[PDB]
């Protein structure tokens, strides 16, 4: 069965105007900015980009590749897809 969401879970993550985007969920490093309550920091592979979100926007990636993890124009998401694939732990600062 599932568990919460944690650190280093991958998934597809989805903000309003975007497509489900490969994203992982990170760490909050000492010293740095906690998210809102019942909020995960998202890091979005390919953009690099950090925003907040709760888990009715995370579609954990081994059950949803099938259906999002697909070529898209946007700027950055097959960089993204190439990422979460093949080195989704890694530092990407």
């Given at each position: 069965?599932?568990?919460?969401?944690?650190?280093?879970?991958?998934?597809?993550?989805?903000?309003?105007?975007?497509?489900?985007?490969?994203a992982?969920?990170?760490?909050?490093a000492?010293?740095?900015?906690?998210?809102?309550p019942?909020?995960?920091?998202?890091?979005?592979?390919?953009?690099?980009?950090?925003?907040?979100?709760?888990?009715?926007?995370?579609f954990?990636?081994?059950?949803?590749k099938?259906?999002?993890?697909?070529?898209?124009?946007?700027?950055?998401?097959?960089?993204?897809?190439?990422?979460?694939?093949?080195?989704?732990?890694?530092?990407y600062?």
């Amino acid at each position: 069965m599932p568990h919460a969401f944690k650190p280093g879970d991958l998934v597809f993550a989805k903000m309003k105007g975007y497509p489900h985007w490969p994203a992982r969920i990170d760490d909050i490093a000492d010293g740095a900015v906690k998210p809102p309550p019942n909020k995960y920091p998202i890091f979005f592979f390919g953009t690099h980009e950090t925003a907040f979100l709760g888990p009715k926007d995370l579609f954990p990636y081994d059950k949803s590749k099938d259906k999002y993890g697909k070529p898209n124009k946007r700027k950055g998401f097959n960089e993204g897809l190439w990422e979460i694939q093949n080195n989704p732990h890694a530092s990407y600062s």
